[PDB]
A paper describes a structure:
The cryo-EM structures were determined for both ancestral and Beta spike trimers after incubation at 37 °C. Single particle ab-initio 3D-classification identified one main canonical 3D-class or map for the trimeric protein that corresponds to a single canonical conformation. As opposed to the ancestral trimer, most Beta trimeric particles are classified into a single model with two RBDs in the up conformation (here referred as two_RBD up conformation). This map was refined to 2.75 Å. Density for the Beta trimer up-oriented RBD is only visible when reducing the electron threshold. The 2xPro mutation was clearly visible in both the ancestral and Beta trimer models, while the other modifications fall within regions that are not resolved. Moreover, this fusion prone tendency observed for Beta is more pronounced in our structure, where only the two_RBD up conformation is present. The two_RBD up conformation of the Beta trimer stochastically presents the three RBD amino acid substitutions, K417N, E484A, and N501Y present in most of the VOC including Omicron, resulting in the potential for higher elicited cross-neutralizing antibody titers. Here we demonstrate the Beta spike trimer in the Sanofi COVID booster vaccine has a preferential two RBD up conformation, providing twice the surface area of exposed RBD amino acids compared to the ancestral spike trimer booster vaccine. Beta spike trimers transitioned from 100% open trimer to ~ 80% canonical trimer in one day after incubation at 37 °C and by day 5 were all in the canonical state.
Severe acute respiratory syndrome coronavirus 2 (SARS-CoV-2), responsible for the COVID-19 pandemic, uses a surface expressed trimeric spike glycoprotein for cell entry. This trimer is the primary target for neutralizing antibodies making it a key candidate for vaccine development. To stabilize both proteins in the prefusion conformation two proline substitutions of residues 986 and 987 were performed. The region encoding for the transmembrane helix and cytosolic tail were replaced by a 27 amino acid C-terminal T4 bacteriophage fibritin foldon domain to ensure protein trimerization.
Numbering used by the authors:
A (entry chain A): 27 to 65, 81 to 130, 167 to 172, 187 to 241, 263 to 331, 529 to 623, 629 to 676, 689 to 811, ...
B (entry chain C): 297 to 441, 448 to 457, 491 to 496, 508 to 620, 641 to 676, 690 to 742
C (entry chain C): 942 to 1139
D (entry chain B): 942 to 990
Write the structure that this text describes.
């Protein structure tokens, strides 16, 4: 009776050869997963017919097409047999397995496509994909409405559909996507890819269509319909909207009502004293929320800014799943279909709006929730209790900053006209727009090199680390260059591996090559390791790395003996943090998304500029050669003028957006240069500038069009509670700590530094006397030993 | 002097200036047409014994023949000959897909009604032309050669008491079948030439290709919708299409104050198509390569700099700095015993010139 | 005169933009003539509007291009002015510890001067000049006690040990007023025997 | 009522931009009318294009 068509009924839309390209084509195709009748009887033709036959003995012989099939009409008749393919109409032409055919009538011509493939022993249509290659074409121009076949054969009907075909390495289509099958397929068609990464993509526009037409004239009349999206005509007022009764008080001479933006929002009925409130019909965006196609094919649909009652009204059965289902949720962003509401607050996975986030979680499905800002905490605050850390962790943080773009120069004249004297002469009448665009692009290109030079070329000499790596136990082998293998470090190789000329388009090479950038980075690293911050102020002054770390603890507020007593532990923590950085870089590739974003943006803009050359712009054709060879010069100056206008507008848009992006990249490069000067060439006291924690030091690494900063910081780990006092009274005189806080466990009072519990006996050396004991609030009684 | 013209100055400061573009010109013209000689049956359409009425216009399909529109447009007997979207002069050069021939008889007042976008009873009830009509209409006096020429007035034939021929084409993508009297030309390869293939012209390099064209395929296309390959009309061979070399031209100058020698860089152009140095930025002509490394004077690209030095223009790989090895050890420290006071000047823009433009008065 | 290029560059860009905008007026933009007076004199009012519209479109496009370029340039100049004001607040009105924010070396002061459409900062900084080699230790081991320097580092002129500040060689006798005790000599790596004067 | 000026300036600028964009729909741009329906049902299909 009926069976599933799976992914059958696809052919080559034209004779143009394509390879390794995903092509989107709108043509009469057989919709995926449609119902194809399984069977002599006469059948309708409609706009097209798909045919199939698993005839083991080739019982099926031929076909008949026509309108009445007997007299008074012309009928096509094929008696394709094992000897000679015979076709008759006026026109005569002579020329287990699964045979497929496609018949269509696009005005003229009668196209036939065919395919012959082996199959296993199955009853229904097999799975997999296949391509139908045209065999013959009949320029008959005959009207056909019914047809017949002259023993199990399937019949399908073609429909006008948009498909995305994936051409393989050599001209053959390997896969196809039916755009209207379901929201995931529409997302694939919109992104022009067969894989979709996790996110939310605004794929379509939803609009409520009018239900009928209303004509109103004073005493062609029609009844007045309210409370629904209806097309109306009020004495020449052509518009579409929802009509509701108004509480407005129109003056008797007034016939229309307009808002601030001069849009008619109220109307008066010509035949009655009724004032109707014109409200625009519902519209908005349609976004598809998906996890990665690697994880699941489930999607949710968000209709933006509409109630959950209008989404049924104004498709394939696969899409109808995403219109009802009781999962229907209403949020201030719009209507969600396909996602569960759990009212459990989690971290945001995919934003929706108004504090709503969606995630793919466990049977796994899509859940919508209110995003959690963080884990609750109440600090045990009291006027005599202090928390002091007794340990620490050395943390290494990675910061990534873009520094430059790709230097692209667009040949203005060759892009607009291109090897065309007539078009160039016509373009000469537009002035200096072309020179302006060239100058702007050249300025951007020079600015990119300036950005790179100002970020990296900051060291005056090329420092070399000594061959003996006696850096107090710290291990820099993963960030120092390896001569035995570019000469890039391990992390730099990881970064470069991870991150990855016609029509008047040229790409200029950068002035500094990656080897030179790596040499700058190596010089900075060697200078920092062997001298500290002295090389950024004057000549590089050598100092042992342990003493430099003692300097940096003194800078963050921790005494030197802490380092000199935990030197092995700190070195091990730093080495483990570096190893963790290496492991994370090897595993995940989402950290380098800041440079990849710039690369993708530039590539997409350039691709749009290239594709704009195929636009007609209201001319005869988009090809100047075709226009010139088809039309005479006096009448070919209009189509060429339209092409000039369109291409000039496109180029101006590209140049403007390039200038804005160049400004953004220049800001990023200025920030990167500031971070190199302050984080790498010194120790910064600005909070959260060189990473989270107390900044100890930093290391630069080069990445494609960017720099990566490894921020070594200090993080206190294990706090403990103590009793504290602002001052202590010994001999009627208040004593204050010279540097630190007063603490007490439960019996005795000591003085300790703030960031590391190290209690010393209170002494006149540790404290200073100031004032009397009758003024300080919270003073406690104790003794000070001299 | 080209740099001087570009900069609108008689003196140029040292640096590199882009002046113009270099493009390889085509060598010869190639016309490759199928070896088909049978003439199209225009006589059977323009010399028929009679024509049908306006409501029963007959169509004749013209294909697989060589058409000669010169005989058509060189005849003064045709009273009206106006063509839309195509030129009668270029009709012979153009090669079409499927030529149609519609014949009917109308009176003089309805001749102008046979035109795209024209309204009226004749156009709206008998024969309407598309808004994107390609082809044209031919009419001539026929009062010499009688009530068999009817006219439909309602949509109802109200017969009363000029022979018209209409041609239609579609030059968009389909393989061409009706060519003109153009002659074929031998095929050359590996040289930038001007080529014509069944109607679409171009300029580029034709080479042997390994593309696996299917038997029904006529030409190839790239990602950016550019004709990358083609099939020879006379031979089953497949020819690639590569654009002729092009690029920008930059002039490295030490300054007209210092000297008058210049260097020329062809950006992205291999030295073959152009004291010749090949760099990753292009072909450098006029500068001598030096193995020594100096500080960058005039940038070129990919770590290459140019400088006026012993006196000639030299091109080198820039030196990133002076090498230094810090005498690092675990028990040695370097401490300064003196100092210098340094005063450094920093310049920062703060504002521009405030300008106001009256849009109405300017325009 | 190339030291003041930035202000000269800004002046040159503004003048070039204005000059190009003025020169754009003498362009046909597809019309038969580039002057409305001659267009109106030659053609009748019904058909002069055809050319007037082309001139209007071209001049509007040129004006919009000029205004957009000016907006981008003004955003850049605003960023530069914000940087200049920050330098004014942090380097003339105070002494900044940020590295290379105001000159190379340890910032001592800065002086402002006015330049056409700009400001000039004279950054006075301190730069160490003549370094010398010394033998150093992280700490010195007295009779069972490990002594660390309060402010500076230990140095040795071959035979004897002193304590000196970091940025200037000013050796001083090691005393209990110069060093502080923390722990014993076993834990510290690189400790050196010496004596501390009390 | 003047301390919170920057936020008010941003809001006013955005609202003015949106209002101007909407108001431009009533502009004529050299056509016979700014109403697309009037343009359609006032001329023949080819001259209305
Ligand atoms: C420290 O540096 C200063 C300045 O470089 C030296 O002062 C110079 O000394 C030489 C030799 O005595 C004189 O000829 C110069 O005239 C001095 N210049 C100035 C500005 O006074 C000084 O000698 C160096 N050494 C010490 C120990 O101060
Ligand atoms: C052509 O494409 C097929 C994939 O369908 C591939 O297996 C084959 O290696 C390619 N090349 C040739 C010469 O067949
Ligand atoms: C849904 O409808 C209610 C009233 O029925 C309305 O208050 C609410 O704003 C609507 N939702 C949205 C997103 O507009
Ligand atoms: C969350 O939803 C569940 C439904 O199973 C319900 O039982 C629970 O009360 C809800 N929580 C809140 C806070 O409303
Ligand atoms: C501090 O933490 C380290 C490991 O992070 C370990 O030595 C121990 O847990 C702590 N050390 C002391 C002395 O408490
Ligand atoms: C430093 O780490 C690398 C890899 O983590 C290791 O191969 C090397 O042995 C380490 N250095 C030392 C001195 O152990
Ligand atoms: C300090 O006391 C508070 C409240 O008594 C407690 O919540 C906190 O855990 C204590 N801190 C430590 C380190 O035990
Ligand atoms: C507090 O610390 C001192 C340190 O000398 C110790 O003697 C005393 O027993 C401690 N008391 C408590 C309650 O921990
Ligand atoms: C802390 O606050 C409590 C609450 O009144 C008070 O009794 C106590 O004296 C205060 N202690 C100090 C040291 O201020
Ligand atoms: C501290 O000691 C003095 C003298 O013994 C006494 O007057 C004062 O009240 C004491 N303070 C407290 C808080 O007990
Ligand atoms: C046209 O040329 C091809 C190749 O030389 C040849 O095979 C073919 O027979 C020719 N056509 C005719 C009609 O001879
Ligand atoms: C340039 O042409 C030569 C000779 O054909 C060739 O060897 C070389 O690979 C080409 N490219 C470059 C960058 O030299
Ligand atoms: C420069 O180096 C290349 C490569 O080793 C060599 O062939 C050439 O002779 C050298 N020229 C000079 C002048 O040193
Ligand atoms: C210090 O010692 C190193 C190595 O012995 C030597 O190169 C250097 O000249 C000496 N003096 C200074 C001021 O660095
Ligand atoms: C080191 O300095 C001390 C004190 O200035 C001096 O007595 C001694 O002779 C010096 N030794 C050398 C080798 O310079
Ligand atoms: C410094 O390193 C060397 C190894 O070259 C070692 O012999 C020496 O003992 C180290 N210094 C100290 C103070 O341990
Ligand atoms: C330092 O002195 C102690 C005690 O006098 C002694 O045990 C130790 O061996 C000495 N170390 C050196 C390196 O002289």
């Amino acid at each position: 009776a009926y069976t599933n068509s799976f992914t059958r009924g696809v052919y080559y839309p034209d004779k143009v050869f394509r390879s390794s390209v995903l092509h989107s084509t709108q043509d009469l195709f057989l919709p995926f997963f449609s119902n194809v009748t399984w069977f002599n009887p006469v059948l309708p033709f409609n706009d097209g017919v798909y045919f199939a036959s698993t005839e083991k003995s080739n019982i099926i012989r031929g076909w008949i097409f026509g309108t009445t099939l007997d007299s008074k009409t012309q009928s096509l008749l094929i008696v394709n047999n094992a000897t000679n393919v015979v076709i008759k109409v006026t026109f005569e032409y002579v020329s287990k397995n699964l045979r497929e055919f496609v018949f269509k009538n696009i005005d003229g011509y009668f196209k036939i496509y065919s395919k012959h493939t082996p199959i296993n022993l199955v009853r229904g249509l097999p799975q997999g994909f296949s391509a139908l290659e045209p065999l013959v074409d009949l320029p008959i121009g005959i009207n056909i409405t019914r047809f017949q076949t002259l023993a199990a054969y399937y019949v399908g009907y073609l429909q006008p559909r948009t498909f995305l075909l994936k051409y393989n390495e050599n001209g053959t289509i390997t896969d196809a996507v039916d755009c209207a099958l379901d929201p995931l397929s529409e997302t694939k068609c919109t992104l022009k890819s067969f894989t979709v990464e996790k996110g939310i993509y605004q794929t379509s526009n939803f609009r409520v269509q009018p239900t009928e037409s209303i004509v109103r004239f004073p005493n062609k009349s029609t009844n007045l319909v309210k409370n629904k999206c209806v097309n109306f005509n009020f004495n020449g007022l052509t518009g579409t909207g929802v009509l509701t009764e108004s509480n407005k008080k129109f003056l008797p001479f007034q016939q229309f009502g307009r808002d601030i933006a001069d849009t008619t929002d109220a109307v008066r009925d010509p035949q009655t004293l009724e004032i109707l409130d014109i409200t625009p019909c519902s519209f908005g965006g349609v976004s598809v929320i998906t996890p990665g196609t690697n994880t699941s094919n489930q999607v949710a649909v968000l209709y933006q800014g509409v109630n959950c009652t209008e989404v049924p009204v104004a498709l394939t059965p696969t899409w109808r799943v995403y219109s009802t289902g009781s999962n229907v949720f209403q949020t201030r962003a719009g209507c969600l279909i396909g996602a569960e509401h759990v009212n459990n607050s989690y971290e945001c996975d995919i934003p929706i709006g108004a504090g709503i986030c969606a995630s793919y979680q466990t049977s796994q499905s899509i859940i919508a929730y209110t995003m959690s800002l963080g884990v609750e905490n109440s600090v045990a605050y009291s006027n005599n209790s202090i928390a002091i850390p007794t340990n620490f962790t050395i943390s290494v943080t990675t910061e990534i900053l873009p520094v430059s773009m790709t230097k692209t120069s667009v040949d203005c004249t060759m892009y607009i006209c291109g090897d065309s004297t007539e078009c160039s002469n016509l373009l000469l009448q537009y002035g200096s727009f072309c020179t302006q665009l060239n100058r702007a692009l050249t300025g951007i290109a020079v600015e990119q090199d300036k950005n790179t030079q100002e970020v990296f070329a900051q060291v005056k000499q090329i420092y070399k680390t000594p061959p003996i790596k006696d850096f107090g136990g710290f291990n820099f082998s993963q960030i120092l260059p390896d001569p035995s293998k570019s000469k890039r470090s391990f992390i730099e190789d990881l970064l470069f591996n991870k991150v990855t000329k016609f029509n008047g388009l040229t790409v200029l090479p950068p002035l500094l090559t990656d080897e030179m950038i790596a040499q700058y980075t190596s010089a900075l690293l060697a200078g920092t390791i062997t001298s500290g911050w002295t090389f950024g102020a004057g000549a590089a002054l050598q100092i042992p790395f342990a003493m430099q770390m003692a300097y940096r603890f003194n800078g963050i507020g921790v005494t030197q003996n802490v380092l000199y007593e935990n030197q092995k532990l700190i070195a091990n923590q730093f080495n483990s943090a570096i190893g963790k950085i290496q492991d994370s870089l090897s595993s995940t590739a989402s950290a380098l998304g800041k440079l990849q974003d710039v690369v993708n943006q530039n590539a997409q803009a350039l691709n749009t500029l290239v594709k704009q050359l195929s636009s007609n712009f209201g001319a005869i054709s988009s090809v100047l050669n075709d226009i010139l060879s088809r039309l005479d010069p006096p009448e070919a100056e209009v189509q060429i003028d339209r092409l000039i206008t369109g291409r000039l507008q496109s180029l101006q848009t590209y140049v403007t957006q390039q200038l804005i992006r160049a400004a953004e990249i220049r800001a990023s490069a200025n920030l990167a240069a500031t971070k190199m000067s302050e984080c790498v060439l010194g120790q910064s006291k600005r909070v959260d500038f060189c990473g989270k924690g107390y900044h100890l030091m930093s290391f630069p690494q080069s990445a494609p069009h960017g720099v990566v900063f490894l921020h070594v910081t200090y993080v206190p780990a294990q706090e403990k509670n103590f009793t504290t006092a602002p001052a202590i009274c010994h001999d009627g005189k208040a004593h204050f700590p010279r540097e630190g806080v007063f603490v007490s466990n439960g019996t005795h009072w000591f003085v300790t530094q703030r960031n590391f519990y190290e209690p010393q006996i209170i002494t006149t050396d540790n404290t200073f006397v100031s004032g009397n004991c009758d003024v300080v609030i919270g003073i406690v009684n104790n003794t000070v030993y001299d | 002097s080209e740099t001087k013209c570009t900069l609108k100055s008689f003196t140029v400061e040292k640096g590199i200036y882009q002046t113009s573009n270099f493009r390889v010109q085509p060598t010869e013209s190639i016309v490759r047409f199928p070896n088909i000689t049978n003439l199209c049956p225009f006589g059977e359409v323009f010399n028929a014994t009679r024509f049908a009425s306006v409501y029963a216009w007959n169509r004749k399909r013209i294909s697989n023949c060589v058409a000669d529109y010169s005989v058509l447009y060189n005849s003064a007997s045709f009273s009206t000959f106006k063509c839309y979207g195509v030129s009668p002069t270029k009709l012979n050069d153009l090669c079409f897909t499927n030529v149609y021939a519609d014949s009917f008889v109308i009176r003089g007042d309805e001749v102008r009604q046979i035109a795209p976008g024209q309204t009226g009873n004749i156009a709206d009830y008998n024969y309407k032309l598309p808004d994107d009509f390609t082809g044209c209409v031919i009419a001539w006096n026929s009062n010499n050669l009688n009530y068999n020429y009817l006219y439909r007035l309602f949509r109802p034939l109200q017969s009363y008491g000029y022979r018209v021929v209409v041609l239609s084409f579609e030059l968009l993508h389909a393989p061409a079948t009706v060519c003109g009297p153009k002659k074929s030309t031998n095929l050359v390869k590996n040289k930038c030439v001007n080529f014509n293939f069944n109607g679409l012209t171009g300029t580029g390099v034709l080479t042997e290709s390994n593309k696996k064209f299917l038997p029904f395929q006529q030409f190839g296309r790239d990602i950016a919708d550019t004709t990358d390959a083609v099939r020879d009309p006379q031979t089953l061979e497949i020819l690639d299409i590569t654009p002729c070399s092009f690029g920008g031209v930059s002039v490295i100058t030490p300054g007209t104050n210092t000297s008058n020698q210049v260097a020329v860089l062809y950006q992205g152009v291999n030295c073959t198509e152009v004291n010749v140095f090949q760099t990753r930025a292009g072909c450098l002509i006029g500068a001598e390569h030096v193995n020594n490394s100096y500080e960058c004077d005039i940038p070129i690209g990919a770590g290459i700099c140019a400088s006026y030095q012993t006196q000639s223009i030299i091109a080198y790989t820039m030196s990133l700095g002076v090498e230094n090895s810090v005498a690092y050890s675990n028990n040695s420290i370097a401490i300064p015993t003196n100092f210098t006071i340094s005063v450094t000047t920093e310049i920062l823009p703060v504002s521009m010139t405030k300008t106001s433009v009256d849009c109405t008065m300017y325009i």
